[PDB]
Design a protein around this nucleic acid. Structure first.
Ligand SMILES: [Mg+2]
Ligand SMILES: [Mg+2]
Ligand SMILES: [Mg+2]
Ligand SMILES: [Mg+2]
Ligand SMILES: [Mg+2]
Ligand SMILES: [Mg+2]
Ligand SMILES: [Mg+2]
Ligand SMILES: [Mg+2]
Ligand SMILES: [Mg+2]
Ligand SMILES: [Mg+2]
Ligand SMILES: [Mg+2]
Ligand SMILES: [Mg+2]
Ligand SMILES: [Mg+2]
Ligand SMILES: [Mg+2]
Ligand SMILES: [Mg+2]
Ligand SMILES: [Mg+2]
Ligand SMILES: [Mg+2]
Ligand SMILES: [Mg+2]
Ligand SMILES: [Mg+2]
Ligand SMILES: [Mg+2]
Ligand SMILES: [Mg+2]
Ligand SMILES: [Mg+2]
Ligand SMILES: [Mg+2]
Ligand SMILES: [Mg+2]
Ligand SMILES: [Mg+2]
Ligand SMILES: [Mg+2]
Ligand SMILES: [Mg+2]
Ligand SMILES: [Zn+2]
Lengths: 66, 177, 136, 115, 94
RNA sequence: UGCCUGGCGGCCGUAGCGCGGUGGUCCCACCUGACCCCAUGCCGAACUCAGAAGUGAAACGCCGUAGCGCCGAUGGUAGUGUGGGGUCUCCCCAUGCGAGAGUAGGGAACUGCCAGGCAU
RNA sequence: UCCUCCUAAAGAGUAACGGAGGAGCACGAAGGUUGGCUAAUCCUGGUCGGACAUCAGGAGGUUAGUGCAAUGGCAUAAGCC
RNA sequence: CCGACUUACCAACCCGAUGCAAACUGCGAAUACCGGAGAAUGUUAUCACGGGAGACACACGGCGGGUGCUAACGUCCGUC
């Protein structure tokens, strides 16, 4: 790689909210604070909700009962 | 090199077991990662592409190549030689570091992220993807943004089929729906 | 009136009409009309023959025209002198040599195909004959 | 990959064949290296040296280095001098004139090959 | 079985072929297998009244040359451009 | 003396495509790393250097297969040089030259020099 | 007035108020040398992005390109840096 | 939005078959042209230089073609 055309590329630490501290090589200079990493993400964990959740019948039977 | 070590330790075993491979060379490997930014608005201003080059170099520590037009096109009011895009190629330690940083930080940070499609291997095992926003990368400060300009990533691998590419990405723990 | 939709050049030379033909054997239908003489066929004679045979067979069956006018014959205007350039293209002509089949027909009885091709021969200038397909 | 090297060397080989001069062809490999002098007709070889030969390989640590390239150049130059070959042309055979090829050429020049 | 009687061509060429065709005959060639090709002469009417059958180009042909039987099969034929006549027939020894 | 491999050639498809197998002692290729010699319009991708942990997967070399390409008869046809003719904007005769296309068929190259490994 | 093809009858040449097109320039680099490289087109996948800008592969093999009109050539490239 | 369909119609690429082209050749003659050797023959019939001209309005027929109506004892090119 060429010497003086590329930006400075140093190591840094990115502390996550959940505590999954990681060390990666970047160019930001200062340390990083992260909100959602690859461990505390709902999709990665597997807890992803949906939209349908039944429909009209359950609501009707729970609101109006003969 | 963390992802390279993780691959060489606990990916070749899984791929060989699930594909009945005879040699380690049969195991697919990630040849390269190329990032592209097709800024089709550089005609009005050259700085609009010079800032895109800086935004693309802030993500990966390489000065981007200012690609040009292969031929003149009238539907886009361009002529041959006009620079309209930025390209970056990553192979080796920087490629692995960018892959790890992407999958660990940038992919979860995407707004309304609900996984990634598994039908973008173009029938050859090389995986294409595209983002609609760049500030998901933590190397960009919100107060210093000029415009929002996305990019498209392509992972070129030695795999011969979409099944093998998807298996390699799953072993690398890539977001799949 | 058969005519090419485009051509590289508008006017061509005269050439000659020496030699025999290549499309001698019937290869598409069952019966055919084969020229015996040597001459020229325009885009109007072939159309008239096609109309005559269509009326003869009452539009039943299928027919094939294996010839096509591609030679731009030209004629100079009336009362003009010589030279001053080449004339203006007027009609198109297909060169015909002995042995060339002009029309082919299938799905028609032979006794009706004979008269259907006789009607076409009666309007075509060159002499023709009735032939049938053969096994190699 | 190997075809691009032949395409690069084709022009030089054709020029040397047209000139009709003795041609010293070198071949580069990460493991070994070869060199040989060839008559202008191109179908007759006179002398040749290589690191695969044990008589010269029993002196070098690694066959793929500039030291081995210089040793091969010296061996081929001394083997051509006894036959009386001094006015010879060089052929990179598609390889860049850098590193092992340059070392071999310099060794030949020092050993007394005029090119 | 279609049986034909043939001759042997002493002279070849365009002139010989045209003489044969004007003398109510026509040349033909028999080839195939591993033997030398044979150039024969055939009567015109006796073959024109035989080739009109579809069996002529599918079945076997028994040719008599020099008082011997040869089993051939029709392989190629050349017909007159604008006349119901024949000019040359290529047989395969089979 | 054979087998395999590398380089330089001879001829330029009967020499090339495609399918299926085989090859790692040596050679070769893939391959490891890179402050250095050297370089990328960015990137040891290419060039180049320092090496041999591992693999013959890819490429490469070899083997057989006629799904292609390719070569190609004999005879016949068209054409044509010369001399004669006819029903002459086209043909025929006498004597020489003799196509192209197509068919039968052939065909999964041959060979020279210099080197390396294994048997002799 | 000059250049390309045909007519021009397989050496050259060969006419008409014949059939089709061009020129009266340009470049200190668009020249020389050295070093390196090979496309037109189509298919698949990918953010704005659409039939077609840019990026990855695959098919294809000069069907592109020549500073210009046409012809003859160009892979050792005469083409592209 | 997305579309589910067939339908008096036309039709791209490719494949199979049939043709045509002076400005189309992956094919390719016969003739003609260059050069060499050889026997025979021809009043050197060959070339170079010098003196002197004449002529540059051609026509017809055969073969090979353009323009004409594949008309002209029509016109324009090559050979005899
Ligand atoms: Mg002609
Ligand atoms: Mg004759
Ligand atoms: Mg090994
Ligand atoms: Mg390497
Ligand atoms: Mg292999
Ligand atoms: Mg013949
Ligand atoms: Mg004559
Ligand atoms: Mg032939
Ligand atoms: Mg043939
Ligand atoms: Mg093979
Ligand atoms: Mg000429
Ligand atoms: Mg001539
Ligand atoms: Mg130039
Ligand atoms: Mg060059
Ligand atoms: Mg696109
Ligand atoms: Mg041009
Ligand atoms: Mg140049
Ligand atoms: Mg022609
Ligand atoms: Mg002579
Ligand atoms: Mg005068
Ligand atoms: Mg005059
Ligand atoms: Mg005259
Ligand atoms: Mg006159
Ligand atoms: Mg005439
Ligand atoms: Mg006249
Ligand atoms: Mg008179
Ligand atoms: Mg006059
Ligand atoms: Zn977290």
């Amino acid at each position: 790689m060429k010497k003086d055309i590329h930006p400075k590329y140093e190591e840094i630490t990115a502390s996550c909210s959940c505590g999954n501290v990681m060390k990666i090589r970047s160019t930001v200079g200062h340390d990083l604070n992260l909100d959602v990493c690859s461990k505390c993400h709902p999709f990665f964990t597997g807890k992803q909700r949906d939209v349908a959740t039944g429909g009209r019948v359950d609501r009707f039977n729970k609101r109006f009962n003969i | 090199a963390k992802l390279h070590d993780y691959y060489k330790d606990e990916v070749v075993k899984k791929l060989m077991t699930e594909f009945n491979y005879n040699s380690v060379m049969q195991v697919p490997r990630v040849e390269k990662i190329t990032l592209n930014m097709g800024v089709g608005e550089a005609i009005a201003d050259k700085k609009l592409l010079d800032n895109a080059a800086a935004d693309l170099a802030a993500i990966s520590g390489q000065k981007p190549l200012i690609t040009k037009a292969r031929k003149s096109v009238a539907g886009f009011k361009i002529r041959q030689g006009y620079p309209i895009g930025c390209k970056v190629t990553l192979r080796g330690e920087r490629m692995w570091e960018f892959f790890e940083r992407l999958i660990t930080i940038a992919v979860p940070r995407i707004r309304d992220f609900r996984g990634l499609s598994a039908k973008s291997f173009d029938g050859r095992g090389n995986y294409s993807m595209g983002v609609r926003e760049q500030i998901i990368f933590p190397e960009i400060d919100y107060d210093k943004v000029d415009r929002v300009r996305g990019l498209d990533i392509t992972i070129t691998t030695t795999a011969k089929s979409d099944e093998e590419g998807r298996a390699l990405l799953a072993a690398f723990d890539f977001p799949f729906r | 009136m058969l005519q090419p939709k485009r051509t590289k050049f508008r006017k061509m030379h005269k050439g000659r009409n020496r030699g025999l033909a290549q499309g001698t054997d019937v290869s598409f239908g069952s019966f055919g009309l084969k020229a015996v003489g040597r001459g020229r066929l325009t885009a109007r004679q072939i159309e008239a023959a096609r109309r005559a045979m269509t009326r003869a067979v009452k539009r039943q069956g299928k027919i094939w025209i294996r010839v096509f006018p591609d030679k731009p014959i030209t004629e100079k205007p009336l009362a003009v002198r010589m030279g001053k350039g080449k004339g203006n293209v007027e009609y198109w002509v297909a060169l015909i040599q002995p042995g060339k089949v002009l029309y082919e027909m299938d799905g028609v009885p032979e006794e009706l195909a004979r008269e259907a091709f006789k009607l076409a021969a009666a309007k075509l200038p060159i002499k023709t004959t009735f032939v049938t397909k053969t096994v190699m | 990959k190997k075809s691009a090297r032949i395409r690069r060397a084709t022009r030089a080989r054709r020029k040397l064949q047209e000139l009709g001069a003795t041609r010293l062809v070198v071949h580069r490999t990460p493991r070994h290296i070869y060199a040989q002098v060839i008559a202008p007709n191109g179908s007759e070889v006179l002398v040749a040296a290589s690191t695969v030969e044990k008589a010269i390989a029993e002196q070098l640590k690694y066959t793929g280095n500039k030291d081995a390239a210089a040793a091969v150049g010296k061996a081929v130059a001394e083997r051509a001098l006894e036959k009386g070959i001094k006015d010879v042309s060089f052929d990179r055979s598609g390889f860049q004139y850098h590193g092992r090829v340059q070392a071999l050429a310099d060794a030949a020049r020092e050993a007394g090959l005029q090119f | 079985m279609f049986t034909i009687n043939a001759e042997v061509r002493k002279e070849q060429g365009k002139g010989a072929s045209r003489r044969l065709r004007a003398a109510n005959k026509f040349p033909a060639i028999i080839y195939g297998g591993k033997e030398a090709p044979l150039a024969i002469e055939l009567d015109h009417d006796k073959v024109m009244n035989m080739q009109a059958k579809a069996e002529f180009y599918s079945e076997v042909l028994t040719i008599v040359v020099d008082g011997k039987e040869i089993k051939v099969k029709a392989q190629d034929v050349q017909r007159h451009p604008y006349k119901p006549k024949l000019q040359h027939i290529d047989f395969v020894r089979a």
